[PDB]
Design a protein around this ligand. Sequence first.
Ligand SMILES: CC1=[N+](Cc2cnc(C)nc2N)CS[C@H]1CCOP(=O)(O)OP(=O)(O)O
Ligand SMILES: CC1=[N+](Cc2cnc(C)nc2N)CS[C@H]1CCOP(=O)(O)OP(=O)(O)O
Ligand SMILES: [Ca+2]
Ligand SMILES: [Ca+2]
Lengths: 675, 675
Amino acid sequence: SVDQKAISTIRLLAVDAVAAANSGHPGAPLGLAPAAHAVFKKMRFNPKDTKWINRDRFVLSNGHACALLYSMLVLYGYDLTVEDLKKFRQLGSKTPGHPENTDVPGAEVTTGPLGQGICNGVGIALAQAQFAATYNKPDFPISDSYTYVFLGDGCLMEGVSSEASSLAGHLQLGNLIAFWDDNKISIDGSTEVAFTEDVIARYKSYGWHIVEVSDADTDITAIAAAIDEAKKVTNKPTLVRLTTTIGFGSLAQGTHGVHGAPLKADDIKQLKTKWGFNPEESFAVPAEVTASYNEHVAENQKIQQQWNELFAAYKQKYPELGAELQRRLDGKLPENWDKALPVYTPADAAVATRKLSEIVLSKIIPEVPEIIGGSADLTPSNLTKAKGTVDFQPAATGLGDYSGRYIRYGVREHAMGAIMNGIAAFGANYKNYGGTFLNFVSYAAGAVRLSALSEFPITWVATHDSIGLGEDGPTHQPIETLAHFRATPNISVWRPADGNETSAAYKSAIESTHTPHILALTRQNLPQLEGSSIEKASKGGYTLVQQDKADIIIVATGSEVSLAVDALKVLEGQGIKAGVVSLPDQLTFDKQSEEYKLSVLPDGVPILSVEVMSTFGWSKYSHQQFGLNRFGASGKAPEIFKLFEFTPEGVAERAAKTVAFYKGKDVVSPLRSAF
Amino acid sequence: SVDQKAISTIRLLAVDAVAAANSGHPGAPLGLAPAAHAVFKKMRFNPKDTKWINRDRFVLSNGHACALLYSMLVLYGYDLTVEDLKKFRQLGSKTPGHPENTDVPGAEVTTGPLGQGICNGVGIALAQAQFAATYNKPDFPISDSYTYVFLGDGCLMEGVSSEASSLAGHLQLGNLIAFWDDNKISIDGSTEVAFTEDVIARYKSYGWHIVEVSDADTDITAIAAAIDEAKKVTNKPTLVRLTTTIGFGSLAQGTHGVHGAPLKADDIKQLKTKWGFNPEESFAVPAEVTASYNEHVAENQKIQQQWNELFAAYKQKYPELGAELQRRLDGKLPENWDKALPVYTPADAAVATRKLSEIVLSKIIPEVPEIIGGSADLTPSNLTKAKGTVDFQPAATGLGDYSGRYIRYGVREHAMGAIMNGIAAFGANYKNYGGTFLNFVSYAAGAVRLSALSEFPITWVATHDSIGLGEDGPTHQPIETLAHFRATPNISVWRPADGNETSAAYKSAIESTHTPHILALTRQNLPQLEGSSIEKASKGGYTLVQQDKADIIIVATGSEVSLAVDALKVLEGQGIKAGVVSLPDQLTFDKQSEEYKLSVLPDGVPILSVEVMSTFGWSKYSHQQFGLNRFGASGKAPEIFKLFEFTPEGVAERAAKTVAFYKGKDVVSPLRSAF
Ligand SMILES: CC1=[N+](Cc2cnc(C)nc2N)CS[C@H]1CCOP(=O)(O)OP(=O)(O)O
Ligand SMILES: CC1=[N+](Cc2cnc(C)nc2N)CS[C@H]1CCOP(=O)(O)OP(=O)(O)O
Ligand SMILES: [Ca+2]
Ligand SMILES: [Ca+2]
């Protein structure tokens, strides 16, 4: 049949792509081609408009199987061709070895690191539910799309998927339909060696619906029926168990050897002949398959055409909501939204930056409907919920509504991070955030790195940033954390010192379209600084205290800026004139012009950095570094600062030693380099 | 009764400790005191010998509840007193706000970061099973101890605990007995807001046995009976559901407010009077409670006395095994074990450092019985299994035996990391390792940081270290990873360049007693270097190519050392004389004498670092840094190196620019500093 021919085409495109690269993963593509065919036939999408907001989304969580995804995209006429498939895994191609949303049309997210994609799918589905609850009206199903996820045994072993699956079940996300490639093979061989749990029983325990397809190597009727069944269960996410043979059709089917290396040439020949293809030909695309797939595309395009008319009618019937929706689909924030950002003066009281963050959120959430967010069981500590908002929960629970704006993630940092990526991936200008203690952002490193690689504007509200948290002690006190994330490409790591800097950090985080943000915020109160403003802090680094005859400049962040200002006064009594630079975000600063940066960190003066955590990275901006390169301590925070000499006198002593060390030396800016 | 009085004593010590600190967590201690009393009465331990190898182990995974643990340790006469309890959460005390194994006698592991302790318990139990299988003989139950773990809702939400619980069920770890504090309250309030899964059904799906105790606020008979029942189920770990009231007895019992802040003074008064204590007194220890607990200690000490005689008889009956066991309990490796380390010459073939690692393991595993390890589903990629070894599996599976030495962790990096910590915590000189790709060590950051804080000699075999892995692309290629771990205190991060350096890295990792190791290893082949040796590489950094008239020194690691040597030849043709330093471990290097370090990185010569990942940290050792501060690419590895100019010519160009940049300048070693 044409469907059988399409499945064979998919299988053979994937195998031929792996063969041409002499690299990659043929096994799962062979096993999942029937399911991919069936799912894409049920999906609504436009290959010519990858951003249609009511499209169904597909996520390949087992991203190593991407030759399958690329084959589907090529067959459906996305902006990806057979010539691109021939360049699978080749430098610069549109067909990288794992899918990247920035590079691959039709890749919703970046997968490959196992477990992430299913969590991203949870976030896409969460966003769709929130979006539909916000905009849909009687006779106006603006949003009614599904989220389809393929995942394998490896994703099911990764703890992040357990976190997200528990939460998705709790949230009753009935438009999420996941498909488990139950092939009983991973890299180390049979799943009997390490993965003998009853997966189905576990998913039932989370509140998921289950459909089992016992012969998913051939039974596309049953796969389609499983989708239909899943769509009837509106209050549970569904897991479809696809019992498949890894590498189906290969001489090596059902073995670990077919997972992750190219097939032998003779194996490819026998695949082709038993499926009616020419064993001498590669990258064959039968025109009847193209015709069948084109029919589905044309039908989907007529569905989108009708959706566009529905949207036009919605704008007439609901003028305010329609204009809001249009603005969001255009990627634009509300005009002058930033006038809601709080502004402070040096006469205002000291405030912890976690509390300043609460105040910002309280002002901007009512002004910017596309902001949603939550916390990983730290709501009253991170201060992430605006008073008067309702939680995102299924209304059946009585605990919230899908129109709610605040997500109770539970103690699930890693899944929170990957769910945030999925919310961003949904689109519609969502600007979403997640709170935890800074030290436990590290639990989510796998997802955070993907936020950076995927260019998603997510925000971590990362409170209790240092030894300033005090008594909880060294298991809770960051040392390495900012260095880790600052060393990751494309992460803005804001460590605001005061009220104006906290508003600048949020302005950056909410305006972002391609860069994730981490906001490192204090437990403890900090003074409002003389010289701070949103305008200056928006440059990422700025001169707080200018001293034209400086003997030294002290560059600091966060809680240490006020310390530097106090040290400047001690130094004056020692006959040393200091300037102060505040560096609330190194990435934003780095992006400023060379001339601006040199105005902040000039030649001809020693520069000392002060920040109560690792000194890594700081030599970009300073000649000498005063940091904390050992673990912390359990005690009252002021006593810990005293112990480690992060006091005005301790900073002054090191500043004086720095001045002494450079006597008789020629000093150029740390910004200079040889290449 | 005296048991009731003991439970009240525990509760009130914990509340009084929190009160004195005006900080900490009274709720879970109040709820878990009956269970703690019951469990410690069943446990075999010696407060005067915390390292008795056949002790039962206790782990408080909900580490915020540590006022409970400290109260137990004080009451049982560990080296912790009421005076220490009065200093709970105070700087420098033996009672920090979360338990630290380095600081607290009777704390087996460092907990506080949720989810870790239960995984550590899995590792303690895994080690006990392996140890017993190795040493026990008929009439000689050298090892027969249990592992008791307390955990709460937060631990059950963290994905790492799902990973470890799936694996523990698979491994049939019948001497593991965990207790869930089922109190339905977390920081964000009721668990109904985020955690509605059927936990018991999930644990059954993993193959655990379940016992439910419906009134764990009072029913110590049922808690004791649950332990007895668990001990009869020898082929499943057991989860005991303790249905408790958080803060039991407090006016605020059953509320989130009792989780994490001191009780009100009037609340403490009413607690004391209803339990028969003096509301005017704090830190009361009734002598009858001390007497009862002392009776149990005395019985346990007689059990250990008899174990010592059993061990003496074992040494006579099994002379070889007895001497091996004695050596391990003394903390000593086999005499001259390191003579098994492979040694290479520059005439030997190029080899990937992952393969060199395989060869090391193949030589040392037969020589050092306390080495065990595994991989997170990457055995044929990391090359972590020695041929001829058997896997650690329950014999009932037919897939291995508990005497086996190789662990199939599955796709569970985070749990692998925390399980490794538990294996180390067991003691008996275990030197254990875990393989994954370097980029996915990041999934386990929560546990890795705890390896460092806990001072455990665990080893990550972290292969595929860079863009040198090629086609899998940027989702797999480390950039920030070494900077992250090097910025963490107390992590040795070895990046060996060749065969001799790989042997030095293992010598360090296996000899370690207090420092975790990460071995960053290549996919791709590297040449054997002229000038390398185990002796020199053991210094962490060394002069590979000495040039007395150097215009520049190039410092490099791993795959970039050979690149630097090739660049030296290009530079010679440009009239520039270079030296080369290899820096296989920055931590080990840092620990050398100042004079040694200056002999490697002298004054008076520009120093350029070369390493194909983040430049963070490198200014400790260099004036200029050539690194990779952007994400990678999917293609053949040599083409990626060419793209980023990590070629002999690209390094030479930057070296020449470095020489030019320092013309006319006075250059001092990067090792110099102002303070
Ligand atoms: C272990 C593995 N990798 C390394 C890998 C490890 N850890 C993380 C976080 N991401 C990864 N990418 C890549 S791939 C995988 C086997 C998957 O086994 P799985 O059953 O899902 O795939 P398959 O056999 O094809 O049915
Ligand atoms: C969310 C929380 N903390 C921050 C916290 C967050 N993430 C990680 C990895 N470790 C932590 N330490 C500390 S504590 C916890 C509530 C526990 O809730 P749980 O039900 O286990 O404790 P309890 O209410 O006392 O019954
Ligand atoms: Ca599989
Ligand atoms: Ca709880």
